[PDB]
């Protein structure tokens, strides 16, 4: 919960250190403190008003390194601090938060595709491994609804997946759910009201503009209006009852486009542009900081 849409890292020619924040209320962008280490394919999440950047990879000319890092950004100080690292590097990770605890899901390390899952306890600054998923998944979308964690699509190393599964923390156990109608790796996955949305992604042939949503009560996936741009490795968040998708790759260009989905009207609209095109960002929402620089 909060007021700005923060976008951390990403990729354009090489992995990026940018931390920028968009204010839907006035259309303004702020540049904040860079990440300590560039990273794309990371996830962002917020707990207790702090922004966490999780996993990813630094794709650079001086060497490509998969990240096990968990770093914390304090909007009150405009500073990043390192937290305890995960058990393993996880590029193209998915992350969700249940009851103040951060779940790191899947992702890759070199040629290995993780089924493993681990949980962060901020109060103790400690990671612990939980039950692994039923399927190895990288480029996996993750969202939380009703204190259950969902892992949606991805890539197992051989095929892009339409499959999805759901984790019950009290049983430390994953269960398959209805697969999506479309195979999607690198989709934006997020929750709006009673529904898990999976927007865009790559089906192994094309970047996608289609968007489908899972109703947890009916156990079905239904397509809604498609986005204006096909995009994979997009950033996604929810703010005041609307979905926002940020950047991505459309098979031609690294997008700067930010689109807003209104569920009331079932329409996607262009709302703003990032200061530069990029894919594989981590995105989350929290309170405004105090001493940034406004982007002209």
């Amino acid at each position: 919960v909060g007021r700005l849409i923060y976008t951390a890292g990403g990729y354009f020619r090489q992995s990026l250190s940018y931390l920028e924040a968009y204010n839907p209320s006035n259309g303004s962008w702020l540049r904040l403190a860079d990440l300590q280490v560039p990273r794309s394919g990371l996830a962002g999440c917020v707990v207790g008003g702090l922004l966490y950047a999780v996993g990813g990879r630094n794709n650079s000319p001086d060497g490509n390194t998969d990240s096990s890092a968990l770093d914390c950004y304090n909007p009150m100080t405009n500073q990043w601090s390192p937290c305890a690292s995960m058990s393993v590097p996880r590029n193209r990770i998915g992350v969700g938060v249940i009851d103040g605890h951060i779940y790191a899901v899947g992702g890759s390390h070199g040629c290995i595709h993780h089924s493993s899952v681990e949980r962060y306890e901020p109060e103790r600054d400690e990671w612990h491994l939980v039950a692994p998923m039923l399927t190895r998944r990288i480029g996996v979308g993750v969202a939380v609804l009703n204190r259950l964690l969902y892992a949606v699509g991805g890539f197992d190393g051989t095929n892009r997946l339409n499959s999805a599964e759901c984790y019950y923390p009290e049983r430390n156990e994953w269960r398959m759910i209805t697969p999506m109608n479309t195979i999607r790796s690198g989709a934006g996955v997020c929750v709006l009201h009673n529904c898990i949305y999976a927007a865009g992604g790559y089906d192994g042939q094309d970047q996608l503009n289609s968007v489908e949503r899972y109703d947890v009560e009916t156990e079905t996936w239904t397509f809604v209006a498609p986005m204006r741009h096909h995009r994979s490795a997009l950033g996604i968040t929810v703010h005041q009852g609307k979905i926002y998708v940020l950047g991505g790759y459309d098979g031609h260009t690294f997008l700067d486009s930010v689109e807003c989905y209104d569920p009331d009207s079932d329409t996607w609209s262009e709302v703003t542009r990032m200061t530069s095109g990029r894919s594989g960002v981590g995105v989350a929402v929290t309170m405004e900081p105090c001493r940034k620089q406004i982007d002209q």
């Binding site: 990729y11 480029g139 894919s279 594989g280």
Partner: peptide, 6 residues
């Protein structure tokens, strides 16, 4: 990888 356009 290719969804990032890497």
């Amino acid at each position: 990888w290719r969804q990032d356009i890497d």
